[PDB]
Short mmCIF file of C-alpha atoms and ligand atoms in Angstrom, two decimals:
data_model
loop_
_atom_site.label_atom_id
_atom_site.label_comp_id
_atom_site.label_asym_id
_atom_site.label_seq_id
_atom_site.Cartn_x
_atom_site.Cartn_y
_atom_site.Cartn_z
CA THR A 12 0.39 0.60 -0.17
CA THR A 13 0.59 3.48 0.04
CA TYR A 14 1.71 4.05 3.33
CA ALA A 15 4.28 0.76 3.77
CA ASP A 16 5.34 2.49 0.72
CA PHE A 17 6.29 5.93 2.82
CA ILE A 18 7.53 3.74 5.55
CA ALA A 19 9.72 1.45 3.07
CA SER A 20 11.17 4.88 1.98
CA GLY A 21 12.96 5.94 5.25
CA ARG A 22 12.19 9.18 4.79
CA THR A 23 9.84 9.39 6.92
CA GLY A 24 11.55 11.58 9.81
CA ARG A 25 13.19 15.19 10.55
CA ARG A 26 14.21 15.36 6.23
CA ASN A 27 17.37 18.32 6.10
CA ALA A 28 17.69 20.52 3.28
CA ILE A 29 19.55 19.95 0.28
CA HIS A 30 22.38 22.30 1.55
CA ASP A 31 22.88 20.21 4.34
CA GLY B 49 -23.08 33.16 -12.55
CA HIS B 50 -21.45 31.08 -9.45
CA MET B 51 -22.54 34.96 -7.07
CA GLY B 52 -25.24 36.91 -7.31
CA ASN B 53 -24.90 40.52 -6.72
CA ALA B 54 -24.65 40.27 -2.71
CA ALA B 55 -22.04 37.85 -2.70
CA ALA B 56 -20.56 39.35 -5.27
CA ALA B 57 -20.27 42.44 -3.81
CA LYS B 58 -19.16 41.37 -0.09
CA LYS B 59 -15.75 39.28 -2.33
CA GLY B 60 -14.90 42.39 -4.39
CA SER B 61 -14.70 44.73 -1.27
CA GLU B 62 -13.13 41.79 0.46
CA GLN B 63 -9.70 41.84 -1.91
CA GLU B 64 -9.84 45.44 -1.92
CA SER B 65 -8.89 46.08 1.46
CA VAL B 66 -7.12 43.08 1.62
CA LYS B 67 -5.08 45.25 -1.22
CA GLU B 68 -4.92 48.45 1.58
CA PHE B 69 -3.93 46.49 4.02
CA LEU B 70 -1.17 44.57 2.05
CA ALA B 71 -0.26 47.98 0.85
CA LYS B 72 0.10 49.72 4.50
CA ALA B 73 1.75 46.27 5.01
CA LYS B 74 5.09 47.66 2.83
CA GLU B 75 4.93 51.52 3.55
CA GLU B 76 5.85 49.81 7.34
CA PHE B 77 7.92 47.00 6.45
CA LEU B 78 9.85 49.11 4.13
CA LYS B 79 11.41 51.38 7.23
CA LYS B 80 12.68 49.19 9.06
CA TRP B 81 14.39 46.79 6.71
CA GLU B 82 15.57 50.34 5.78
CA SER B 83 16.63 50.72 8.77
CA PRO B 84 17.30 47.63 10.68
CA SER B 85 17.75 47.55 14.73
CA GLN B 86 20.16 46.31 16.23
CA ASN B 87 21.96 45.26 19.82
CA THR B 88 18.05 44.94 21.62
CA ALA B 89 19.69 42.70 24.81
CA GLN B 90 22.60 40.76 25.88
CA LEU B 91 23.82 37.93 27.13
CA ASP B 92 23.84 38.03 30.40
CA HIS B 93 19.68 39.23 30.21
CA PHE B 94 18.56 35.93 30.51
CA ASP B 95 18.80 31.84 32.00
CA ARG B 96 19.64 28.83 30.31
CA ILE B 97 17.51 26.56 31.01
CA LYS B 98 17.19 23.17 27.81
CA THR B 99 18.22 23.16 23.59
CA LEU B 100 15.15 23.53 22.07
CA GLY B 101 16.40 22.24 18.65
CA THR B 102 20.08 22.04 17.04
CA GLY B 103 21.23 21.26 13.62
CA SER B 104 24.24 22.37 11.09
CA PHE B 105 22.49 26.44 12.03
CA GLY B 106 23.45 25.70 15.52
CA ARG B 107 21.45 25.22 18.20
CA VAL B 108 18.00 26.96 19.97
CA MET B 109 17.27 27.01 23.65
CA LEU B 110 14.11 28.02 25.94
CA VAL B 111 16.09 31.00 28.31
CA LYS B 112 14.50 32.71 30.76
CA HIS B 113 14.75 36.67 30.63
CA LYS B 114 16.40 37.93 34.22
CA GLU B 115 13.78 40.70 35.52
CA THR B 116 10.34 39.81 33.33
CA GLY B 117 10.92 35.40 34.11
CA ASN B 118 9.23 35.19 30.53
CA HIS B 119 10.84 32.54 28.65
CA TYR B 120 12.96 33.18 25.07
CA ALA B 121 13.65 30.66 22.09
CA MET B 122 17.81 31.57 22.16
CA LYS B 123 19.20 31.64 18.59
CA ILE B 124 22.89 30.52 19.13
CA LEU B 125 25.03 30.47 15.99
CA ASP B 126 29.24 30.07 16.06
CA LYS B 127 30.62 32.68 13.88
CA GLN B 128 33.35 31.06 12.82
CA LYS B 129 31.34 28.06 12.03
CA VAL B 130 28.58 30.63 10.23
CA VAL B 131 31.58 31.86 8.34
CA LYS B 132 32.45 28.02 7.43
CA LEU B 133 29.80 26.80 5.90
CA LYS B 134 29.59 29.72 3.40
CA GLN B 135 26.43 31.71 5.67
CA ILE B 136 27.21 34.66 5.83
CA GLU B 137 24.47 35.82 4.31
CA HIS B 138 21.43 33.62 5.15
CA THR B 139 22.19 35.20 8.30
CA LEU B 140 22.58 38.78 7.82
CA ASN B 141 19.65 38.12 5.43
CA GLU B 142 17.20 36.16 8.22
CA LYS B 143 17.20 38.21 10.69
CA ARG B 144 17.63 40.94 9.22
CA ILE B 145 13.54 39.78 7.22
CA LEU B 146 13.10 38.56 11.09
CA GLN B 147 13.28 42.64 12.73
CA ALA B 148 11.12 43.74 9.82
CA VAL B 149 8.25 41.71 8.82
CA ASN B 150 5.18 42.58 11.12
CA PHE B 151 2.19 39.33 10.60
CA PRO B 152 0.62 36.78 13.07
CA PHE B 153 1.78 33.87 11.92
CA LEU B 154 5.83 34.94 11.86
CA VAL B 155 7.28 34.71 15.06
CA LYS B 156 8.56 37.82 16.33
CA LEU B 157 11.99 38.52 17.00
CA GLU B 158 11.83 40.01 21.13
CA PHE B 159 16.10 40.56 20.64
CA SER B 160 18.60 40.17 18.89
CA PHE B 161 22.94 41.25 19.49
CA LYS B 162 26.52 39.83 19.33
CA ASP B 163 29.35 39.56 21.25
CA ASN B 164 32.55 37.60 20.47
CA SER B 165 31.77 33.72 19.01
CA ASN B 166 28.43 34.44 17.99
CA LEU B 167 25.32 35.66 17.44
CA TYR B 168 21.66 35.56 19.17
CA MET B 169 18.25 35.41 18.15
CA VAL B 170 15.87 35.84 20.79
CA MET B 171 12.46 34.83 19.74
CA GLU B 172 9.14 34.55 21.39
CA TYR B 173 9.37 30.84 22.68
CA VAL B 174 6.66 28.88 20.90
CA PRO B 175 6.26 25.70 23.25
CA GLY B 176 3.98 24.01 20.80
CA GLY B 177 6.21 21.89 19.31
CA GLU B 178 6.78 21.11 15.47
CA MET B 179 3.97 20.76 13.65
CA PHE B 180 6.14 17.33 12.54
CA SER B 181 5.67 15.89 15.77
CA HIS B 182 2.13 15.97 16.30
CA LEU B 183 1.60 15.23 12.01
CA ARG B 184 3.58 11.62 12.63
CA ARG B 185 2.21 11.15 15.82
CA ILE B 186 -1.70 11.13 15.09
CA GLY B 187 -0.90 9.80 11.69
CA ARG B 188 -3.12 12.71 9.74
CA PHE B 189 -5.28 15.25 10.34
CA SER B 190 -8.98 15.34 8.97
CA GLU B 191 -9.92 17.88 6.54
CA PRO B 192 -11.08 20.33 8.75
CA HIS B 193 -8.06 21.16 10.61
CA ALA B 194 -5.47 20.96 7.87
CA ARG B 195 -8.01 23.41 5.82
CA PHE B 196 -7.09 26.14 8.77
CA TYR B 197 -3.38 25.59 8.72
CA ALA B 198 -3.49 25.74 5.25
CA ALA B 199 -5.50 28.89 5.07
CA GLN B 200 -3.05 30.33 7.57
CA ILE B 201 -0.27 29.39 4.99
CA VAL B 202 -1.95 31.19 2.28
CA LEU B 203 -2.20 34.19 4.36
CA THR B 204 1.20 34.26 5.39
CA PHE B 205 2.79 33.94 2.05
CA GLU B 206 0.18 36.44 0.17
CA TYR B 207 1.64 39.13 2.94
CA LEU B 208 5.18 37.41 2.31
CA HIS B 209 4.84 37.96 -1.99
CA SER B 210 3.47 41.06 -1.65
CA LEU B 211 7.40 42.33 -0.14
CA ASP B 212 8.95 40.21 -2.45
CA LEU B 213 9.99 37.64 0.19
CA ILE B 214 9.80 33.80 -1.04
CA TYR B 215 10.04 31.15 1.45
CA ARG B 216 11.36 28.35 -0.17
CA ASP B 217 11.10 26.47 2.68
CA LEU B 218 7.62 24.97 4.05
CA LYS B 219 7.30 21.79 4.60
CA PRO B 220 6.14 20.72 8.93
CA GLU B 221 9.72 20.73 9.89
CA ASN B 222 9.62 24.38 10.09
CA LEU B 223 6.31 25.09 10.85
CA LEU B 224 5.60 25.27 14.93
CA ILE B 225 2.50 25.30 17.11
CA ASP B 226 1.47 27.91 19.50
CA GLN B 227 -0.16 28.11 23.17
CA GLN B 228 -3.45 28.58 21.14
CA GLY B 229 -3.18 26.14 18.13
CA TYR B 230 -1.89 28.79 15.67
CA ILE B 231 1.00 28.03 13.62
CA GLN B 232 4.08 30.39 13.57
CA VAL B 233 6.95 30.86 10.84
CA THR B 234 10.14 30.97 12.34
CA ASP B 235 13.50 29.69 10.22
CA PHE B 236 13.82 32.41 7.38
CA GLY B 237 17.49 31.80 6.40
CA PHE B 238 16.37 30.68 2.64
CA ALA B 239 13.75 33.42 1.83
CA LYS B 240 14.96 35.99 -0.72
CA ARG B 241 14.01 38.96 -1.68
CA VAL B 242 13.23 39.38 -5.75
CA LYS B 243 10.86 41.18 -7.40
CA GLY B 244 11.34 38.20 -10.53
CA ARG B 245 13.20 35.73 -11.03
CA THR B 246 15.67 33.62 -8.84
CA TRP B 247 17.70 30.72 -9.58
CA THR B 248 19.12 28.82 -6.54
CA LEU B 249 19.33 25.21 -5.81
CA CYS B 250 17.62 24.96 -2.44
CA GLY B 251 14.54 23.62 0.07
CA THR B 252 13.90 20.40 0.77
CA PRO B 253 13.42 17.46 -1.95
CA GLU B 254 9.92 16.80 -1.05
CA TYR B 255 9.09 19.89 -1.52
CA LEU B 256 10.55 20.91 -4.69
CA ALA B 257 9.08 22.45 -7.44
CA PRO B 258 9.61 20.68 -10.58
CA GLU B 259 10.94 23.93 -11.81
CA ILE B 260 13.37 24.18 -9.18
CA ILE B 261 14.54 21.14 -10.16
CA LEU B 262 15.34 21.68 -14.60
CA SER B 263 17.76 24.46 -13.22
CA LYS B 264 15.22 26.44 -14.14
CA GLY B 265 14.50 30.08 -13.22
CA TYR B 266 11.52 29.66 -11.24
CA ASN B 267 9.98 33.03 -9.21
CA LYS B 268 7.49 32.54 -6.67
CA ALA B 269 5.11 30.44 -7.22
CA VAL B 270 7.58 27.42 -6.08
CA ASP B 271 6.11 28.78 -2.99
CA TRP B 272 2.45 27.90 -3.88
CA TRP B 273 3.81 24.49 -4.72
CA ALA B 274 5.20 23.36 -1.77
CA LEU B 275 2.18 25.06 -0.41
CA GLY B 276 0.30 21.91 -2.10
CA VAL B 277 3.06 18.65 -0.92
CA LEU B 278 2.39 20.71 2.28
CA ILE B 279 -1.38 20.42 1.89
CA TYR B 280 -1.12 17.26 1.02
CA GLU B 281 1.34 15.52 3.07
CA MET B 282 -1.71 16.50 6.33
CA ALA B 283 -4.56 15.01 4.94
CA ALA B 284 -2.59 11.71 3.68
CA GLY B 285 0.12 11.55 6.59
CA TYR B 286 3.06 11.21 3.64
CA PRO B 287 3.79 13.72 1.35
CA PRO B 288 2.87 13.36 -2.22
CA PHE B 289 5.92 12.26 -4.20
CA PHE B 290 8.24 10.02 -1.77
CA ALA B 291 11.15 7.52 -2.34
CA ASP B 292 13.87 5.84 -0.84
CA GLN B 293 16.99 8.69 -2.86
CA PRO B 294 16.10 11.64 -3.85
CA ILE B 295 16.50 11.63 -7.37
CA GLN B 296 13.95 8.92 -7.75
CA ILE B 297 11.83 11.66 -6.03
CA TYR B 298 12.18 13.92 -8.41
CA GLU B 299 11.45 12.36 -11.22
CA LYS B 300 7.60 11.82 -9.99
CA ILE B 301 7.28 15.72 -9.40
CA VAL B 302 8.69 16.43 -12.80
CA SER B 303 6.34 13.54 -13.76
CA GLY B 304 2.94 15.23 -14.10
CA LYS B 305 1.44 12.44 -12.22
CA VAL B 306 -0.41 12.49 -8.55
CA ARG B 307 -1.99 9.59 -6.96
CA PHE B 308 -4.58 10.88 -3.97
CA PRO B 309 -5.85 9.28 -1.36
CA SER B 310 -9.22 7.65 -1.48
CA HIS B 311 -10.62 9.18 1.34
CA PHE B 312 -9.55 12.78 -0.20
CA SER B 313 -12.96 14.89 -1.21
CA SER B 314 -13.26 15.27 -4.41
CA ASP B 315 -12.63 19.63 -3.90
CA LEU B 316 -9.20 18.58 -2.07
CA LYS B 317 -7.86 16.66 -5.44
CA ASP B 318 -8.94 19.95 -7.37
CA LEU B 319 -7.12 22.52 -4.86
CA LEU B 320 -4.05 19.53 -5.09
CA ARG B 321 -4.66 19.58 -8.72
CA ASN B 322 -3.49 22.78 -9.47
CA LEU B 323 -1.30 23.49 -7.08
CA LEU B 324 0.91 20.71 -7.85
CA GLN B 325 0.76 21.88 -11.20
CA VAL B 326 4.12 21.12 -13.32
CA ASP B 327 2.76 23.13 -16.47
CA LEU B 328 3.52 27.17 -14.93
CA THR B 329 1.27 28.16 -16.98
CA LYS B 330 -1.54 26.50 -16.19
CA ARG B 331 -0.97 26.83 -11.36
CA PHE B 332 -2.98 28.70 -8.44
CA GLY B 333 -1.28 31.60 -7.31
CA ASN B 334 0.92 31.87 -10.53
CA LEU B 335 -2.36 33.70 -12.90
CA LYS B 336 -3.62 36.20 -13.31
CA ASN B 337 -5.78 36.28 -10.26
CA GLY B 338 -3.39 35.96 -8.00
CA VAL B 339 -3.76 34.68 -4.80
CA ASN B 340 -7.33 34.47 -5.57
CA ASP B 341 -7.35 31.12 -6.88
CA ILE B 342 -6.79 29.47 -3.63
CA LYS B 343 -8.68 31.76 -1.30
CA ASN B 344 -12.21 31.41 -3.26
CA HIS B 345 -11.44 27.82 -4.67
CA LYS B 346 -14.25 25.42 -3.26
CA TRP B 347 -11.99 23.54 -0.75
CA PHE B 348 -12.08 26.65 1.61
CA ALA B 349 -15.46 27.70 0.97
CA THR B 350 -16.17 27.61 4.23
CA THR B 351 -12.43 30.21 5.47
CA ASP B 352 -13.28 33.14 6.93
CA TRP B 353 -10.04 34.91 5.54
CA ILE B 354 -10.47 37.68 8.54
CA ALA B 355 -11.85 35.06 10.79
CA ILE B 356 -8.58 33.81 10.56
CA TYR B 357 -6.09 36.48 10.68
CA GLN B 358 -7.48 37.81 13.47
CA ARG B 359 -7.04 34.42 15.20
CA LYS B 360 -10.85 34.81 16.31
CA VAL B 361 -11.02 30.69 15.12
CA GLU B 362 -11.13 28.08 17.26
CA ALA B 363 -8.17 25.96 17.06
CA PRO B 364 -9.16 21.90 16.26
CA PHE B 365 -6.27 20.95 18.71
CA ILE B 366 -4.45 22.95 21.04
CA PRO B 367 -0.80 21.04 22.72
CA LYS B 368 -0.87 19.96 25.31
CA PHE B 369 0.38 22.48 28.27
CA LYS B 370 2.30 22.62 31.57
CA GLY B 371 2.67 25.66 32.22
CA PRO B 372 6.00 28.74 30.99
CA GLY B 373 9.12 26.96 30.53
CA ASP B 374 7.55 23.63 29.96
CA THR B 375 9.28 21.80 26.94
CA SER B 376 7.58 18.41 26.91
CA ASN B 377 6.63 19.02 23.34
CA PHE B 378 10.48 19.33 22.03
CA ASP B 379 12.98 16.75 21.64
CA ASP B 380 16.27 16.09 24.04
CA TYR B 381 19.49 17.09 23.31
CA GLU B 382 22.75 16.49 24.82
CA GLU B 383 23.31 19.93 26.49
CA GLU B 384 27.09 21.21 25.08
CA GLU B 385 28.41 24.65 26.75
CA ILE B 386 27.97 28.25 25.42
CA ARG B 387 31.89 29.95 24.51
CA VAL B 388 32.85 32.94 24.63
CA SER B 389 36.13 33.61 23.40
CA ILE B 390 37.72 37.13 24.69
CA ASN B 391 39.29 37.74 21.50
CA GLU B 392 36.31 38.83 19.18
CA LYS B 393 35.58 36.54 15.82
CA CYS B 394 34.85 37.15 12.25
CA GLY B 395 33.74 40.61 13.18
CA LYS B 396 33.72 43.14 10.00
CA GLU B 397 31.71 40.59 8.12
CA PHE B 398 29.18 40.38 10.85
CA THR B 399 28.69 44.09 11.46
CA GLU B 400 25.56 44.65 10.28
CA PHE B 401 23.44 42.45 12.35
C1 LIG C 743 16.00 26.76 14.48
C2 LIG C 743 14.99 25.23 14.60
C3 LIG C 743 14.97 24.78 13.87
N1 LIG C 743 14.79 23.10 13.37
C4 LIG C 743 12.58 23.78 12.60
C5 LIG C 743 12.49 24.46 14.07
C6 LIG C 743 12.81 25.14 14.39
N2 LIG C 743 13.57 25.53 15.47
S1 LIG C 743 13.10 25.38 16.15
O1 LIG C 743 12.23 24.91 16.39
O2 LIG C 743 14.59 24.87 17.46
C7 LIG C 743 12.15 27.44 16.84
C8 LIG C 743 13.27 27.84 16.37
C9 LIG C 743 13.60 29.52 15.92
C10 LIG C 743 12.20 30.30 17.18
C11 LIG C 743 10.88 28.92 17.85
C12 LIG C 743 10.56 29.43 19.52
N3 LIG C 743 10.27 29.09 20.00
C13 LIG C 743 10.36 26.97 20.17
C14 LIG C 743 11.73 26.27 19.11
C15 LIG C 743 11.99 27.65 17.38
#
């Protein structure tokens, strides 16, 4: 499911900006 | 047509009154922009309590003013580290913006000063924590709850754009919730005052507009794209474009395809298709009717824009508040000393601070 895909992405935590 | 005479007259008058407000707001902004305030307090006026946040930017600490007992959030930047990370201009610009703007959903800079080692921006303490935390905990916001927050961002961008400020840093991580449940925008390091186009690759992958990814010159329409991403994430619990790695995220962003959860209303999907519009000639917020295409959209039909601005709407969610100085809505961080060298560092660079 889409939710499961989101969990699998590894990008559920706070996201850094590009420069970081 | 869609409106009878009374509704059309009321809307027209409302839109003209926005123009009048923005003209005065610009006059006031430009006075402070041209003559910025400096050196309005010093370090020993404050007790340092606890670290509220950290990053490459430095840290933000909860502090207490010794005389009043008022709490504030003090951003501490090491002048030498700012220089090393090539952030002099961004740091000066952030402080200049913060001391010049005035809007109910923009955090107020209450004091600023510097010493031999550091720069200090003392802001109102916003005790409800990041929208991010609440969103990940609750999972997703109902459409009315998402709409309440979205309306505040719409008004805030209407204000900033009128000042020729592009924001470029919208995401739930950068939005705080105050004691009344309203939003505070705090970070202005990526904001830029430009009337036309600009070219810097900056922002957060999930929130980047296609024209940024594609190395185009771009304009304030990138903020309206980012609003679409934010509304989607608030209402779904996850953003519209995600993947293991940024490159794959960018492919999806530029593709012109977005999919929606089955619980999204038709009104919400129509708004999002018009915000998450890859074709700049068609994106809401970027057409002849400007911000009115957003404010007058069916998804916002129940929104009383003036009541939101006046903070007279009852918020759908109030963060737990155990009193002044309570930090329970923020994470715990390792506490580090605050060194003030006996020798001034990077003085010329930061004369304007
Ligand atoms: C700069 C960091 C970066 N991470 C994203 C969120 C913004 N913060 S913060 O939560 O530490 C914060 C910044 C400014 C004013 C605040 C006022 N009250 C609390 C925290 C405050």
